[PDB]
Amino acid sequence: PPEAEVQIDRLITGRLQSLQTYVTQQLIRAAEIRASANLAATKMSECVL
Amino acid sequence: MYICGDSTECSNLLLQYGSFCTQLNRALTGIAVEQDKNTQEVFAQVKQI
Amino acid sequence: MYICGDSTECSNLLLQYGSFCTQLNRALTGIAVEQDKNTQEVFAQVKQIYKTPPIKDFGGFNFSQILPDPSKPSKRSPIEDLLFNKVTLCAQKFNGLTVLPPLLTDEMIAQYTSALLAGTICSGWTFGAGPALQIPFPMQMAYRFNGIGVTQNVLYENQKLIANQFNSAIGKIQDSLSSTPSALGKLQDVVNQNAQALNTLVKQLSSNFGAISSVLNDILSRLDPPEAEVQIDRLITGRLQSLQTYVTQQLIRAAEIRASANLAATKMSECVLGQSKRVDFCGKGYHLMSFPQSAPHGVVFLHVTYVPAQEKNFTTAPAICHDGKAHFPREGVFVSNGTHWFVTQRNFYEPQIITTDNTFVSGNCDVVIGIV
Amino acid sequence: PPEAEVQIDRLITGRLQSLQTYVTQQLIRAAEIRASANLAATKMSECVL
Amino acid sequence: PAYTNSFTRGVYYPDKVFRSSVLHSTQDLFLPFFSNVTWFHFDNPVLPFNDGVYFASTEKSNIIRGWIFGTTLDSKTQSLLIVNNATNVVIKVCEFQFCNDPFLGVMESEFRVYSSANNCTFEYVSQPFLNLREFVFKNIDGYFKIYSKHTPINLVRDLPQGFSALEPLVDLPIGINITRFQTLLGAAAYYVGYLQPRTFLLKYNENGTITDAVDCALDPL
Amino acid sequence: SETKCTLKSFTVEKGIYQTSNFRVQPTESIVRFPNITNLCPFGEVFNATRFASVYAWNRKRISNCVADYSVLYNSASFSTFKCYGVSPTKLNDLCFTNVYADSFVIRGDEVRQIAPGQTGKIADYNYKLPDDFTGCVIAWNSNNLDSKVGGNYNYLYRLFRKSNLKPFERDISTEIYQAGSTPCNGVEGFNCYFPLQSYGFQPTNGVGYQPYRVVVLSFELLHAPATVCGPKKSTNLVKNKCVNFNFNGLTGTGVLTESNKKFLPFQQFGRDIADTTDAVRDPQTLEILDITPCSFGGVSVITPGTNTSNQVAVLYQDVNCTEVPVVYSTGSNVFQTRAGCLIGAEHVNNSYECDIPIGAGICASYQTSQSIIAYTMSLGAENSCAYSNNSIAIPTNFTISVTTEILPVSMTKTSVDCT
Ligand SMILES: *[C@@H]1O[C@H](CO)[C@@H](O[C@@H]2O[C@H](CO)[C@@H](O[C@@H]3O[C@H](CO)[C@@H](O)[C@H](O)[C@@H]3O)[C@H](O)[C@H]2NC(C)=O)[C@H](O)[C@H]1NC(C)=O
Ligand SMILES: *[C@@H]1O[C@H](CO)[C@@H](O[C@@H]2O[C@H](CO)[C@@H](O)[C@H](O)[C@H]2NC(C)=O)[C@H](O)[C@H]1NC(C)=O
Ligand SMILES: *[C@@H]1O[C@H](CO)[C@@H](O[C@@H]2O[C@H](CO)[C@@H](O)[C@H](O)[C@H]2NC(C)=O)[C@H](O)[C@H]1NC(C)=O
Ligand SMILES: *[C@@H]1O[C@H](CO)[C@@H](O[C@@H]2O[C@H](CO)[C@@H](O)[C@H](O)[C@H]2NC(C)=O)[C@H](O)[C@H]1NC(C)=O
Ligand SMILES: *[C@@H]1O[C@H](CO)[C@@H](O)[C@H](O)[C@H]1NC(C)=O
Ligand SMILES: *[C@@H]1O[C@H](CO)[C@@H](O)[C@H](O)[C@H]1NC(C)=O
Ligand SMILES: *[C@@H]1O[C@H](CO)[C@@H](O)[C@H](O)[C@H]1NC(C)=O
Ligand SMILES: *[C@@H]1O[C@H](CO)[C@@H](O)[C@H](O)[C@H]1NC(C)=O
Ligand SMILES: *[C@@H]1O[C@H](CO)[C@@H](O)[C@H](O)[C@H]1NC(C)=O
Ligand SMILES: *[C@@H]1O[C@H](CO)[C@@H](O)[C@H](O)[C@H]1NC(C)=O
Ligand SMILES: *[C@@H]1O[C@H](CO)[C@@H](O)[C@H](O)[C@H]1NC(C)=O
Ligand SMILES: *[C@@H]1O[C@H](CO)[C@@H](O)[C@H](O)[C@H]1NC(C)=O
């Protein structure tokens, strides 16, 4: 354990970086999708109705 | 589960990083709730089927 | 200050990580400038401050719950006061977390809103498209009714009833805001999200991050520099990652808030300073006007909407073949109660005898389908 | 090599962090510019023609 | 025998920090909520002391003159003869051969207790044990920490609902290996609970005082 | 010039800029300590006829005494004085709570087995050092006291054991170990032998088996009321000034005042919602002190642009004006605003249109010889709409005005090669 701690720390740091990158990309994509959904809602409230 | 697959030692090592990824889990949950709200806003405009 | 609290042995190590603190400071400064521009764009649209008219005898309508009241020490309308004393939410300060004050104080926002309101009552909507033109409020109501299809005679012949309905709705909206627990959900959610983000950012300080202790002073006092440098490096890496995460989340949330503020400014310009014919964009039903009301870190409109009511259904014919010629209605529908025929407006039952004034002829009646 | 690997690894982590930060900033700014471009397209459609 | 149902009990200040209107969460040994505390009414010898043991010490005339910790006893293994007297409270740690209790009448007759003596490493003098004097005896990290709180509710059966925070009194810096303990008393009324690792959310008042705590293992709510 | 350097250019445009971060410097120091004068018997445990057997290692506890370790550094000649987790020079200051001295004797080759994780027969079953170890190790050759010509066989080890013992475990059982199909009913034959067999201790033995007295000083950190305090002073107490303090082991800088929130008799310090050190208790005469951080705030520089003029003003973000001890080449015209302490600006009363935003209404500009002025911003003109029923206003003329409006469309398409 006293030596495996270092390797575990390196792996944890790498996986945390990857997960943070994925979450940030998902947040940006969700913002874009929300903008598109707001545009679609305006179209439904304005064109068909 | 992702960072440290069903391992006690790796989970204990990750615990030292504070609330780094509880934030990530909360962000993803917020994204999902926002998607549900998006669908509801676009389609459930009138509730008199 | 956040990464290395008043420690030379930590600042001289942070200097190795390049220009990161400058980047984060620039990002947060940009966010603050964007917030100021958001408020200025939303509220500072008309740059002429109209005095609030003293009288309240606006032909029957009662602007007492939206107009500012000078009796209170703060010049805020009762609805604005309820909105202020319904959003309640502490001061971190301490370790390098300062909060800048807004450019436009709440009194200035209230004065801007009052100016917009007094422009709406006095001049109608021409004050947002040139010079303010005074006009009696019943006449402005008639000219807003004419926008949605019904004629002026609908309003004047029912002025007392319309004023009573307006006053009743204005009185009901305050009770609806006060009684309902959710009510102001968006502003409270924004405040809660910011507070949670800041609290988590402070909480990230008390974490070892793979070091021997969570306090830089303890580490630099219990260890010699050559071996304390590694622990300080680990702590610096952890704190830098936390600060980067907070800055990115703030950037995304500020972008969302900027989008919402652009939408609010569009609503303020296209609803208060006029009357919109976009369906279900400026209220439920046909739109008549709106009344802005200041709220903590946001705006709260009071849309006024004409909405139809109890209906009676008749039989209709597209045209009338009188002398072979097919008269079509000019601005109405051809209805009938079973025996006699009439031409009436589309959004109200005001029967009129079918004369050549209300109809136009367009040829023989051997082409139209369903002519009577 | 035995120590050059450690030094190069430190440099790689630093440069990766810098590039990721730049890419995230560019993504957010491009989203803002896309919103502005959509506004410009709407204005061109509804004010020019 | 009598297991009762227990209530919101066993809550003690974890450390010596002062938190005001905070909902801090601590992971430490605690008595689980709504557990089954054992009523022993003469059943002194068995008392299987686990890692940390809660004690009731219900309304009595202070007949409890102390406690006897240790498993083998017989003056072979180190024992804790923590005999709190009427005054000055003797705290004695030594390999003591144990037979029975003082049994001072139903008084001033014979303070015999132990028989022999050995190394006798440690001794402490203070004034604890001044009613429902609960106890959170906990022997961890070479520290035997004691906690207590006096609440003379004087009701029927046992502890009905009354929540309270049990302030610490003293520690004990010796590394004895203890898995058994004794109760030193006619009929008695005492309960013994067992500690388990849990996580609490002790709510603090305007001043530092646990007003209400919850257990993050009981139920999903 | 600071703004010029921050902008990395010789030309400054009109606006408000941020240059640095003002922060009040400390003035005095605090070494508050309790009353402890008696010295610990370290030399007693370092001067004994026999220390212990490797399995009978002593665990002498030290508490409630001032312990100076400077003598253990210069006035001694230990061969091995490694200190794990602590700095030997930075060791005469920390006030540890519990310090245990593990005393025994070992061989010259086996002196290296006292490590956090070292293996070997001595380091597996006879003595276990945990990973997290803030203590140190003391070891030196002692071929003058324990040396017996017949051999100090009273020292014995425990090779014959199955599983490694847990850290800080004292094993006393001397019974015969089971190492195979032996019946272990006394026996002492076949595959079972005495775990404590011998210690070849002839004085002529080499340095690899010469006696070495090992005293391991394992001390817990400052997470409790300090009892074993290092030697120092105990300075008096000062208040209402940003000074650094050394309350027990607490270290920081603050303007600690008289605390209002009362403490329980057992609680020492307190924390706020974000677990930040708020209040402390005096190791000297008991008094609760409300520690709060001293004033600090990022300076900002207001310039009308180097093209227009070289006159500039300084706004301190949150300081309450008076705290401006040392930039600051000039002074006067000090004006306290809700957003800070403007310096070098004339606070006029005539409201104008905002040019350089500041905050909370105030907004500076360069209005005429010209100087930098600050004023409450003006929302707009004073147009009055004369409302009157039965009266209307109707235009008679137009103007046909053309306005220019700008919108960004695209940025520069850039691609970066990662490798
Ligand atoms: C309002 O409508 C009237 C309709 O005539 C416009 O008045 C015209 O304004 C122009 C520009 O000011 C006048 O020209 C000027 O006239 C005199 C004499 O030469 C002098 O001030 C200047 O040299 C210049 O030429 C023009 O005479 C005048 N027409 C009449 C019949 O008076 C006016 O422009 C409209 N308002 C606006 C804001 O456009
Ligand atoms: C709206 O203008 C009318 C103009 O007629 C005002 O009505 C007059 O009010 C005065 C004061 O009460 C009466 O003495 C007159 O008899 C009214 N005129 C008529 C023809 O009845 C009315 O006051 C104006 N509205 C307001 C709010 O002042
Ligand atoms: C407009 O409505 C307000 C209430 O929202 C009216 O104020 C009340 O007036 C009555 C008499 O009409 C008083 O008895 C009440 O005490 C008033 N309420 C409050 C809260 O002050 C107001 O009079 C209305 N204005 C007009 C012109 O009708
Ligand atoms: C439909 O409406 C017409 C027009 O109002 C009604 O005809 C009138 O009927 C009344 C009696 O109800 C007569 O006095 C009027 O002279 C009629 N007017 C005309 C212009 O002829 C008719 O009765 C209505 N039909 C029904 C079924 O209600
Ligand atoms: C009016 O609507 C009702 C309800 O649908 C229907 O039954 C009735 O026939 C309608 N009347 C006419 C005259 O069409
Ligand atoms: C545990 O507590 C419950 C609830 O009071 C009780 O029914 C039960 O007998 C106790 N003992 C065991 C061994 O479950
Ligand atoms: C036992 O208590 C008596 C008084 O009841 C006291 O005099 C004596 O010192 C105590 N023994 C101790 C403290 O060891
Ligand atoms: C009692 O303990 C002492 C102190 O170490 C010791 O000398 C003596 O042998 C012990 N007696 C027994 C029977 O173990
Ligand atoms: C714990 O110590 C006791 C002495 O009270 C002893 O009898 C018991 O065997 C010890 N437990 C273990 C697992 O060694
Ligand atoms: C504890 O706080 C309460 C209010 O919650 C207050 O009334 C009381 O005086 C405080 N107790 C002490 C000892 O200060
Ligand atoms: C001992 O410390 C106490 C702490 O309350 C203090 O009041 C007292 O003056 C100190 N005594 C001496 C002699 O320093
Ligand atoms: C600022 O300092 C002055 C002078 O000491 C004092 O009167 C005033 O209360 C202080 N203001 C604040 C907000 O601390």
Side-chain angles (χ1 to χ4, degrees):
Chain A
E3 147 74 4
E5 230 83 333
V6 196
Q7 328 275 328
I8 292 328
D9 256 320
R10 311 209 47 173
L11 270 201
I12 279 179
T13 303
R15 310 260 194 78
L16 214 29
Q17 257 190 3
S18 265
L19 203 36
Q20 257 184 357
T21 288
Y22 164 70
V23 158
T24 279
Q25 298 263 347
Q26 284 325 95
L27 277 180
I28 285 162
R29 196 144 331 131
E32 137 72 14
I33 280 306
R34 168 174 49 78
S36 192
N38 273 2
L39 178 53
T42 305
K43 257 138 176 303
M44 176 100 51
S45 168
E46 204 141 335
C47 319
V48 49
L49 307 195
Chain B
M1 198 101 67
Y2 178 71
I3 297 271
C4 296
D6 51 74
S7 188
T8 85
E9 307 96 346
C10 197
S11 99
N12 278 314
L13 255 298
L14 168 96
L15 205 67
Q16 297 203 306
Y17 284 79
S19 67
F20 227 66
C21 87
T22 291
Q23 225 172 339
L24 310 185
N25 219 339
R26 175 204 300 156
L28 277 179
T29 299
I31 272 186
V33 172
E34 169 194 294
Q35 304 302 339
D36 281 338
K37 167 173 81 70
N38 265 1
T39 294
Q40 196 118 4
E41 273 203 330
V42 189
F43 272 117
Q45 286 269 6
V46 60
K47 263 159 292 204
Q48 281 262 348
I49 164 184
Chain C
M1 174 80 140
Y2 178 61
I3 305 271
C4 305
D6 61 278
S7 153
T8 315
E9 286 109 336
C10 198
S11 93
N12 72 336
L13 294 201
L14 173 57
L15 268 192
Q16 291 191 355
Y17 267 79
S19 59
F20 268 4
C21 299
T22 297
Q23 248 174 341
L24 310 183
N25 292 347
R26 194 216 316 286
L28 281 159
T29 278
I31 272 178
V33 154
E34 197 173 4
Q35 302 313 287
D36 257 343
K37 184 145 78 52
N38 270 350
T39 287
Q40 280 224 3
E41 163 145 23
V42 157
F43 282 107
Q45 294 214 282
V46 155
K47 262 170 199 311
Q48 325 229 351
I49 300 300
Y50 295 92
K51 283 202 40 161
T52 284
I55 72 167
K56 299 251 221 278
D57 286 86
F58 294 116
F61 307 86
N62 187 13
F63 299 130
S64 100
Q65 304 271 120
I66 48 142
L67 273 191
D69 176 67
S71 101
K72 297 155 256 291
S74 47
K75 312 291 179 217
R76 287 210 288 274
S77 188
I79 284 174
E80 280 162 303
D81 249 351
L82 160 77
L83 295 191
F84 250 68
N85 311 330
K86 191 140 288 303
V87 172
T88 55
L89 217 163
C90 173
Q92 321 290 337
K93 200 236 289 199
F94 302 159
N95 46 285
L97 304 193
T98 36
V99 162
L100 312 184
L103 207 189
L104 282 184
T105 89
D106 288 341
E107 300 303 327
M108 272 165 198
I109 287 319
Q111 276 169 53
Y112 264 140
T113 278
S114 175
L116 281 155
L117 213 29
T120 283
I121 290 124
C122 189
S123 34
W125 72 77
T126 57
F127 87 99
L133 310 184
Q134 31 152 337
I135 169 173
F137 195 85
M139 292 215 58
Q140 176 200 152
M141 212 35 178
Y143 292 176
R144 274 166 202 271
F145 257 36
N146 224 137
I148 77 189
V150 317
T151 37
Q152 325 193 348
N153 59 6
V154 152
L155 164 81
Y156 291 119
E157 280 149 24
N158 309 316
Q159 197 180 319
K160 179 64 71 40
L161 163 71
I162 279 194
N164 285 357
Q165 295 193 7
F166 186 100
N167 302 337
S168 298
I170 271 285
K172 278 182 185 178
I173 199 43
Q174 162 109 36
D175 297 355
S176 146
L177 272 160
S178 70
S179 170
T180 296
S182 158
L184 310 90
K186 319 217 65 209
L187 322 155
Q188 175 77 302
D189 253 347
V190 152
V191 175
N192 257 342
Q193 280 166 96
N194 176 40
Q196 251 69 84
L198 257 177
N199 169 42
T200 278
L201 179 58
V202 191
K203 212 76 85 180
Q204 286 294 135
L205 270 191
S206 60
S207 277
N208 320 313
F209 272 113
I212 88 172
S213 212
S214 190
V215 202
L216 272 168
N217 294 329
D218 200 30
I219 275 191
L220 84 83
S221 151
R222 296 177 35 227
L223 255 64
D224 285 329
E227 75 262 23
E229 276 188 352
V230 202
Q231 318 309 307
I232 295 191
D233 189 7
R234 300 210 60 80
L235 277 181
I236 274 190
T237 288
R239 270 115 179 247
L240 250 170
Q241 284 214 288
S242 273
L243 210 60
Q244 211 75 41
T245 306
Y246 167 71
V247 153
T248 288
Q249 299 283 11
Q250 268 319 284
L251 273 180
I252 295 181
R253 225 185 320 278
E256 190 278 332
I257 287 307
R258 181 249 331 256
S260 165
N262 283 341
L263 164 65
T266 280
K267 268 175 205 294
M268 164 96 46
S269 100
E270 291 182 37
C271 288
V272 196
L273 331 173
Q275 149 181 17
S276 147
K277 310 196 193 17
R278 320 169 73 202
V279 202
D280 203 348
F281 160 78
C282 199
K284 191 54 159 195
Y286 310 120
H287 178 249
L288 295 192
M289 28 183 164
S290 50
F291 298 129
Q293 294 291 310
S294 150
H297 292 147
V299 80
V300 170
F301 301 95
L302 289 193
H303 299 302
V304 171
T305 54
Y306 172 103
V307 156
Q310 44 207 52
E311 73 242 29
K312 204 160 81 64
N313 57 340
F314 332 91
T315 162
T316 169
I320 302 297
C321 170
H322 168 42
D323 311 326
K325 332 182 310 300
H327 303 231
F328 294 73
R330 191 84 68 67
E331 198 249 348
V333 277
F334 284 164
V335 309
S336 33
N337 64 350
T339 326
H340 305 65
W341 285 87
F342 295 113
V343 43
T344 190
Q345 331 155 357
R346 269 161 267 253
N347 313 136
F348 205 77
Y349 190 49
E350 188 145 89
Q352 312 275 64
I353 180 150
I354 313 128
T355 87
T356 65
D357 252 19
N358 312 135
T359 65
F360 67 90
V361 298
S362 198
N364 62 75
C365 66
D366 283 55
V367 277
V368 194
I369 283 174
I371 182 149
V372 163
Chain D
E3 168 107 347
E5 302 290 65
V6 175
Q7 313 309 285
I8 292 186
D9 197 293
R10 295 226 268 278
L11 275 185
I12 294 328
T13 306
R15 267 100 171 265
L16 252 75
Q17 211 174 7
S18 188
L19 235 184
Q20 284 210 140
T21 300
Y22 163 64
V23 152
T24 282
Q25 297 291 339
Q26 201 89 340
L27 262 170
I28 302 178
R29 276 200 301 269
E32 150 176 37
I33 291 299
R34 166 167 46 70
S36 172
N38 286 332
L39 177 53
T42 280
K43 255 162 192 163
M44 171 91 62
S45 298
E46 313 177 14
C47 315
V48 175
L49 51 150
Chain E
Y3 284 154
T4 79
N5 82 317
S6 203
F7 277 93
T8 57
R9 299 243 75 89
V11 161
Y12 64 106
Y13 299 98
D15 276 27
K16 297 136 298 312
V17 293
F18 174 80
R19 319 189 184 277
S20 276
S21 67
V22 202
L23 299 201
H24 183 248
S25 99
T26 88
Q27 156 58 258
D28 261 7
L29 301 193
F30 286 104
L31 165 84
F33 277 17
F34 297 93
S35 68
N36 32 40
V37 79
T38 40
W39 202 352
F40 283 174
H41 225 300
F42 289 166
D43 299 69
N44 336 117
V46 270
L47 260 314
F49 163 82
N50 273 337
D51 40 288
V53 151
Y54 164 81
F55 206 110
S57 281
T58 85
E59 167 56 65
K60 283 302 206 193
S61 57
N62 283 37
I63 311 105
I64 296 305
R65 268 297 93 87
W67 290 276
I68 294 177
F69 285 27
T71 72
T72 324
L73 316 176
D74 302 350
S75 86
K76 311 158 92 99
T77 68
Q78 182 84 312
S79 320
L80 287 135
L81 184 63
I82 321 171
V83 168
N84 31 265
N85 307 359
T87 326
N88 294 106
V89 179
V90 158
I91 292 100
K92 266 298 297 150
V93 193
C94 201
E95 287 93 352
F96 278 163
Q97 165 70 79
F98 286 115
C99 43
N100 267 283
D101 71 335
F103 186 58
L104 248 54
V106 316
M107 300 87 88
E108 291 153 320
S109 317
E110 276 100 55
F111 333 105
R112 27 164 80 191
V113 184
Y114 68 127
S115 319
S116 34
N118 290 106
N119 201 293
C120 286
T121 305
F122 164 100
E123 154 64 38
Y124 180 52
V125 278
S126 206
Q127 184 24 269
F129 169 56
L130 62 136
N131 35 56
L132 289 88
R133 320 185 298 275
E134 296 170 52
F135 290 110
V136 199
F137 299 12
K138 157 163 100 170
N139 184 58
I140 59 162
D141 190 8
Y143 262 17
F144 164 100
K145 331 199 215 297
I146 204 181
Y147 310 81
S148 182
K149 155 70 57 161
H150 289 37
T151 313
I153 171 70
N154 308 129
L155 271 199
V156 85
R157 301 305 299 116
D158 55 290
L159 51 100
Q161 272 103 57
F163 197 39
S164 195
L166 295 49
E167 293 136 74
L169 305 103
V170 87
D171 308 336
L172 188 122
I174 305 92
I176 319 110
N177 205 68
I178 315 110
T179 95
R180 196 126 40 85
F181 92 74
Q182 270 321 97
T183 48
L184 316 184
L185 201 163
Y190 302 110
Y191 308 81
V192 161
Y194 291 162
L195 259 68
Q196 278 101 70
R198 292 294 191 76
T199 306
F200 283 8
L201 320 189
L202 319 97
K203 167 217 274 300
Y204 293 77
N205 224 322
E206 278 302 320
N207 356 286
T209 323
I210 321 292
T211 305
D212 181 31
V214 305
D215 196 314
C216 323
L218 205 47
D219 43 278
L221 162 65
Chain F
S1 270
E2 218 170 348
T3 306
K4 285 218 202 157
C5 293
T6 298
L7 292 198
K8 214 83 75 160
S9 168
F10 265 103
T11 50
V12 176
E13 279 84 5
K14 195 199 223 199
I16 189 135
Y17 294 88
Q18 184 187 38
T19 52
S20 60
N21 190 39
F22 172 82
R23 161 214 313 256
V24 181
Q25 281 328 294
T27 37
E28 305 148 7
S29 170
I30 284 311
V31 203
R32 258 311 188 214
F33 268 156
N35 332 328
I36 294 289
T37 323
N38 48 284
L39 269 79
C40 316
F42 278 59
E44 165 267 335
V45 87
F46 297 147
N47 303 332
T49 313
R50 83 278 157 261
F51 275 30
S53 175
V54 326
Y55 94 109
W57 52 292
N58 316 321
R59 194 100 164 109
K60 170 75 82 59
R61 144 80 157 244
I62 315 298
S63 46
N64 321 306
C65 53
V66 157
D68 174 273
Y69 303 7
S70 96
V71 285
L72 265 57
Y73 224 53
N74 35 44
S75 298
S77 296
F78 323 100
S79 81
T80 321
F81 191 36
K82 195 67 184 64
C83 300
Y84 304 73
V86 86
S87 149
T89 312
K90 269 314 121 184
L91 187 32
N92 232 349
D93 273 28
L94 331 168
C95 289
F96 331 92
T97 68
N98 50 94
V99 38
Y100 293 10
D102 316 62
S103 182
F104 65 125
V105 200
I106 209 51
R107 304 51 171 181
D109 288 340
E110 276 73 29
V111 78
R112 70 146 200 191
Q113 315 292 78
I114 319 300
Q118 182 90 253
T119 61
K121 257 81 175 153
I122 316 291
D124 277 336
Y125 347 96
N126 286 270
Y127 197 94
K128 191 91 213 85
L129 212 52
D131 162 12
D132 171 66
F133 183 45
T134 329
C136 34
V137 287
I138 283 89
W140 79 119
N141 170 229
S142 60
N143 62 352
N144 299 76
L145 257 290
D146 268 342
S147 323
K148 161 169 32 170
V149 200
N152 233 5
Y153 295 136
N154 34 296
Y155 300 151
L156 312 111
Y157 72 72
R158 206 187 251 104
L159 185 147
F160 293 133
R161 193 140 170 254
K162 29 187 81 158
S163 150
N164 38 71
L165 84 178
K166 328 157 285 301
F168 294 160
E169 208 286 294
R170 216 182 168 271
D171 193 8
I172 272 298
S173 53
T174 62
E175 285 98 15
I176 305 313
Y177 170 68
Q178 324 95 345
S181 196
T182 169
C184 320
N185 325 317
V187 193
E188 289 114 14
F190 197 17
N191 274 52
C192 76
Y193 329 97
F194 213 114
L196 310 101
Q197 102 286 355
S198 96
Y199 183 10
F201 208 71
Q202 276 270 51
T204 83
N205 236 353
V207 314
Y209 310 90
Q210 261 160 29
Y212 272 84
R213 311 274 173 81
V214 184
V215 174
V216 190
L217 279 168
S218 148
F219 43 100
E220 197 254 311
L221 219 60
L222 298 110
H223 316 325
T227 88
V228 193
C229 240
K232 237 337 129 315
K233 240 359 243 97
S234 177
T235 52
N236 45 281
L237 199 92
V238 316
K239 298 146 173 255
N240 302 77
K241 282 175 53 55
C242 173
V243 298
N244 47 21
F245 42 81
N246 199 343
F247 277 44
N248 285 347
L250 261 299
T251 322
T253 324
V255 306
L256 73 186
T257 86
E258 310 95 345
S259 167
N260 320 132
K261 26 178 171 138
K262 208 45 180 43
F263 268 53
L264 268 276
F266 73 105
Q267 319 209 308
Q268 292 328 301
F269 33 59
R271 270 96 173 249
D272 87 11
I273 298 85
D275 64 89
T276 313
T277 311
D278 226 10
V280 292
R281 238 176 196 181
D282 195 29
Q284 204 61 217
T285 161
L286 263 277
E287 192 37 67
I288 43 168
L289 291 165
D290 208 19
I291 279 180
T292 88
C294 34
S295 314
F296 78 109
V299 191
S300 64
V301 174
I302 302 182
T303 85
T306 177
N307 165 83
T308 308
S309 168
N310 284 20
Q311 260 274 82
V312 301
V314 152
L315 156 80
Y316 296 111
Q317 205 43 255
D318 204 341
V319 317
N320 182 55
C321 265
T322 50
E323 283 87 48
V324 284
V326 284
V327 281
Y328 204 40
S329 306
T330 79
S332 100
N333 287 284
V334 167
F335 173 52
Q336 159 92 41
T337 91
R338 198 138 285 247
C341 188
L342 214 30
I343 272 161
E346 310 174 12
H347 171 232
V348 317
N349 312 328
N350 311 8
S351 324
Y352 313 125
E353 185 44 56
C354 189
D355 253 350
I356 315 292
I358 289 191
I362 328 288
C363 165
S365 68
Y366 195 43
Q367 184 174 313
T368 204
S369 266
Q370 315 144 298
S371 99
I372 290 278
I373 83 179
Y375 46 76
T376 321
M377 80 168 307
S378 151
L379 311 155
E382 208 55 37
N383 183 17
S384 177
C385 187
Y387 174 76
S388 207
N389 82 326
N390 81 75
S391 99
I392 204 171
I394 273 178
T396 55
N397 229 354
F398 29 80
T399 191
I400 303 263
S401 75
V402 164
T403 89
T404 283
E405 150 160 304
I406 317 155
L407 294 127
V409 157
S410 89
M411 317 155 22
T412 60
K413 320 171 42 194
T414 75
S415 84
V416 182
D417 188 81
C418 178
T419 278

